[PDB]
Point group: C2
Chain length 302, copies 2
């Protein structure tokens, strides 16, 4: 029993974390095979930077890459979108089975927060619909990475680049493409209005039911069209047929059809929780995907 905000075991990623220093900037790099990936803004105050330009001046020995107390030597440097690729002369013997994947808003992943190439914390979060992440990052955390694990395979999906003025965070995939309408320079940038991830709330309500927490269930069911009218009123993401289909396993396990659970969610959006809680929370959690709920409520291992 129990339901916790659960991250993937971070060991496969810890063995990949290195420190990258260049000029006065120090941040984290991801050492996979013989390449260290890191944010391109480690490059050498021009506030509308010309990254390629500044990069050609750079010598390989300008990039001080520190793997534990062992210093790697850079033998090449190239650039892909907002990520710098530093070719090193040694393949990481700890390189896990891995892929680079780009995730969709609403999908969850684990962040290994690092400082000076040293892992210091791991937490689970979701890519918000406004493409930010509500993370926990201090100065020096840039280059910390987000990931999922499937079996023995690490899917790297996120690299941290910056904090927005509201305190939420922005970054790229491992191919250097930003999540959301952000750029890696000093300019006025703001997170858009965020919305709640409806399918994840429903998944979490199924988790609550599996854990015996049932007071919000009601006899009623609604339509996809009626619910999305209510959802848009409450700044909830639209629920699609694909979302219903993905919730299928939880619907079958619980006896609660998705549109049946939607009538519960609607009631709750319109009436509140009335001082009651669900899985120890007085808010509707939206950072558990349907797969997270199945995975934590069945004990899948890595």
């Amino acid at each position: 029993s129990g339901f916790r905000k659960m991250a993937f075991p971070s060991g496969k990623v810890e063995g990949c974390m290195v420190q990258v220093t260049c000029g006065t900037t120090t941040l984290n790099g991801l050492w996979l095979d013989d390449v260290v990936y890191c944010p391109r803004h480690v490059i050498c105050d021009m506030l509308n930077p010309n990254y390629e330009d500044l990069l050609i001046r750079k010598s390989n020995h300008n990039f001080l890459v520190q793997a534990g107390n062992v210093q790697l030597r850079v033998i090449g440097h190239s650039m892909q979108n907002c990520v710098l690729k530093l070719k090193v002369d040694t393949a990481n013997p700890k390189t896990p089975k891995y892929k680079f994947v780009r995730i969709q808003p609403g999908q969850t992943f684990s962040v290994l927060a690092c400082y000076n190439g040293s892992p210091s914390g791991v937490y689970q979060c979701a890519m918000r619909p406004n493409f930010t992440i509500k993370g926990s990052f201090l100065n020096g955390s840039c280059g910390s990475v987000g990931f999922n694990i499937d079996y023995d395979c690490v899917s790297f999906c996120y690299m941290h680049h910056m904090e927005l003025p509201t305190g939420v965070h922005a970054g790229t995939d491992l191919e250097g493409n930003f999540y959301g309408p952000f750029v890696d320079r000093q300019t006025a940038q703001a997170a858009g209005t965020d919305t709640t991830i409806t399918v994840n709330v429903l998944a979490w309500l199924y988790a609550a039911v599996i854990n015996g927490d049932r007071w919000f269930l009601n006899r009623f069911t609604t339509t996809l069209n009626d619910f999305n009218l209510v959802a848009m009123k409450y700044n909830y993401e639209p629920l699609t047929q694909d979302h219903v289909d993905i919730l299928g396993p939880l619907s079958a396990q619980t006896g609660i059809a998705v549109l049946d659970m939607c009538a519960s969610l609607k009631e709750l959006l319109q009436n509140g929780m009335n001082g009651r809680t669900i899985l120890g929370s007085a808010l509707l959690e939206d950072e558990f995907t349907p797969f997270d709920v199945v995975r934590q409520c069945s004990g899948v291992t890595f």
Copy 2:
């Protein structure tokens, strides 16, 4: 900025997890140097549930009765001994991935990370706190026994919890790594109930300081309180008494924010009376009590 329920990187513990089997029972073990630690109730049968005589059961065991598997490698048990409620399996191989480590027994309100495992394989990592009633609100399924809770000091893993059982309310009970249960619990299927839980007041106050550090002030007020008046109120909300130790411990956060501890206590009093009025603190509509003062300083300041 930002505040997340954050676990320690689990890799140093992942490299220690093994599978231990006696007869029909399989659970997790902790392999450090040449000793595997696991809950002694792995030697129980379906008939030894209510009143096992572990000394009698263990004396009947021979080393080859213990099937210990590390990955695909079966370890060979060369000796066994019992220390309180943990079994210590001496094996012929020292774990080459043994971190610097130490066994620490923690006090209620202390937090730690749990690496939930099944069949010796890590499933996920989450953060917990030892409740005042000596349970933990974990996320465990069948086969999770022997999963451990831990903290990390620089590079030293402090093992503080080993999972043994789930109580009827769905909360969890376990031992330190010397085999001593936290709380009045025993490794028997005899009827056992968690005492009424209470809120870890000092942790809530730390979290309110974390909220202030992260820019939120709406819950502050112009009042202070005496320590005794605060505890008289808090006890009526099933909050733990706040001691002078706790006041001392909140000193650094008081200094960093400019809000005296007894001043913040007056804010907590008011929040207890009023609730949040549709507002949140650090993204929560409830008062969070599973962040210690040490946690807050580490995550908010470094």
